[PDB]
């Protein structure tokens, strides 16, 4: 009896931990989004800054 | 049973009864665990005379009603008045028919079998519930704190228990009981405030002192240092406005009152403090699970809502227990309702629906069915 009452409450809190895992996943995806945008903007600006200089070399 | 029927959950506290439906995050109703009867006849002509009154309705009429508790020290003592508390729960507070909803009940640990049988009989013969169940208040507190292993210090109004639990198994060989909680603390506060010159003796004054206890008292981390500070500085004193407009200043009594939990000698009781009660309860368990109990020591019930009590308990159990044990108190903000919230969680689980006593099983077996279902 106590084991059933333990396993169903454990299933309940496992669902709770799954929800907390989803919240943490949401924050980690936000982190991924901002990090990706930052260094994508950086490398595009860098390779496009390296191409304008190369164009400066081309006469 | 239709899967859309939400079960009723009722917490049988000695001070306050609590009630709601399975799946709610908190009880929908809370009311004093009292039934009242007129002090004299002929007082209430024109106000709807009754043979008895319950809950807030009786509480406000304390001046004309003799008030009695059917729940005392965690144990039921009057079954007609218990039926009236349950009547008030179903029809007046929750406003639903109990024969249409399963009912889950809470109880003190080590509750005598006769009481369980009487609860079962009342539920299935008086209120004709389709199903019902009973569970230990401390165990439901552990469930509400998200745990299956740990020791719960469950302190309501008239009693305290320390209940060690291993993977949902409550452990009677290690449970300990302490007949001391907010009721006794309120009496002690009346005593020390009367010694302070604010004499409080009447049944109404006792509730004013309970309000002082709820608002201004706290558990100090160091009793001696706190006493020294109070005696050397008045920064610990607080003003309280009595219902008549008189303002009274409450001093060291703020923490001398709850200190009786840790040092029952102030009450004349030759008993363990709550810290010792928990520590000795853990030390009556098997050595292998003591570490988990130390790491999951939970405080629950209305008497545990003080400031600082968690820190004091942590300090005491760190000083008492071996240095190897990773001690940790857990004291949730809603811990006054965790007793009931555990029942909500328990009764709303789909796999729990096999655990009920059914009306059929009661008819087949009689009240003793409770010894085969409810723990």
Curated annotation (Swiss-Prot), chain A:
Compartments, record wording: Nucleus
Assigned protein family? Belongs to the SNF2/RAD54 helicase family. SWR1 subfamily.
Q: Which disease is it linked to?
A: Floating-Harbor syndrome: A rare genetic disorder characterized by proportionate short stature, delayed bone age, delayed speech development, and typical facial features. The face is triangular with deep-set eyes, long eyelashes, bulbous nose, wide columella, short philtrum, and thin lips.
UniProt subunit comment: Interacts with CREBBP and EP300. May be part of a complex containing SRCAP, CREBBP, CARM1 and GRIP1. Component of the chromatin-remodeling SRCAP complex composed of at least SRCAP, DMAP1, RUVBL1, RUVBL2, ACTL6A, YEATS4, VPS72, ACTR6 and ZNHIT1. Component of a NuA4-related complex which contains EP400, TRRAP/PAF400, SRCAP, BRD8/SMAP, EPC1, DMAP1/DNMAP1, RUVBL1/TIP49, RUVBL2, actin, ACTL6A/BAF53A, VPS72 and YEATS4/GAS41.
* Role noted for this protein: Catalytic component of the SRCAP complex which mediates the ATP-dependent exchange of histone H2AZ/H2B dimers for nucleosomal H2A/H2B, leading to transcriptional regulation of selected genes by chromatin remodeling. Acts as a coactivator for CREB-mediated transcription, steroid receptor-mediated transcription, and Notch-mediated transcription.
Tell me the protein's name. Helicase SRCAP
This chain's source organism reads Homo sapiens (Human)
Taxonomy-wise, where does this protein's organism fall, top ranks first? Eukaryota, Metazoa, Chordata, Craniata, Vertebrata
Q: Which gene encodes it?
A: SRCAP
Included range, full protein: 194 to 252 of 3230
Swiss-Prot record, chain B:
* Sites of Tele-methylhistidine modification: 73
Sorted alphabetically, the Gene Ontology BP terms of this entry are: adherens junction assembly; apical protein localization; axonogenesis; cell motility; cellular response to cytochalasin B; chromatin remodeling; cytoskeleton organization; establishment or maintenance of cell polarity
Position(s), cross-link (Microbial infection) Isoglutamyl lysine isopeptide (Glu-Lys) (interchain with K-50): 270
Q: What is the effect of changing residue 146 to S?
A: In CSMH; somatic variant
Q: How is the protein modified post-translationally, according to the record?
A: ISGylated. Oxidation of Met-44 and Met-47 by MICALs (MICAL1, MICAL2 or MICAL3) to form methionine sulfoxide promotes actin filament depolymerization. MICAL1 and MICAL2 produce the (R)-S-oxide form. The (R)-S-oxide form is reverted by MSRB1 and MSRB2, which promote actin repolymerization.
- Name the keywords, alphabetized: Acetylation, ATP-binding, Cytoplasm, Cytoskeleton, Deafness, Disease variant, Dystonia, Hydrolase, Intellectual disability, Isopeptide bond, Methylation, Nucleotide-binding, Nucleus, Oxidation, Ubl conjugation
From what superkingdom does this record's organism come?
Eukaryota
Where does it live in the cell? Cytoplasm, Cytoskeleton; Nucleus
What EC number(s) would the UniProt record show? Answer: 3.6.4.-
* Cross-referenced InterPro entries: Actin, Actin/actin-like_CS, Actin_CS, ATPase_NBD
What GO terms are given for molecular function? ATP binding; ATP hydrolysis activity; identical protein binding; kinesin binding; nitric-oxide synthase binding; nitric-oxide synthase regulator activity; protein kinase binding; structural constituent of cytoskeleton
Q: Locate the N-acetylmethionine modifications and list their residues.
A: 1
Location of N-acetylaspartate modifications: 2
Q: Which residues form a coiled coil?
A: none
Note the Pfam families from the entry.
Actin (PF00022)
Q: What class of enzyme is it?
A: hydrolase
Q: Relate the assembly described in the record.
A: Polymerization of globular actin (G-actin) leads to a structural filament (F-actin) in the form of a two-stranded helix. Each actin can bind to 4 others. Identified in a IGF2BP1-dependent mRNP granule complex containing untranslated mRNAs. Component of the BAF complex, which includes at least actin (ACTB), ARID1A, ARID1B/BAF250, SMARCA2, SMARCA4/BRG1, ACTL6A/BAF53, ACTL6B/BAF53B, SMARCE1/BAF57 SMARCC1/BAF155, SMARCC2/BAF170, SMARCB1/SNF5/INI1, and one or more of SMARCD1/BAF60A, SMARCD2/BAF60B, or SMARCD3/BAF60C. In muscle cells, the BAF complex also contains DPF3.
Task: Report what the protein is called.
Answer: Actin, cytoplasmic 1
| Native organism | Homo sapiens
Q: Which gene encodes it?
A: ACTB
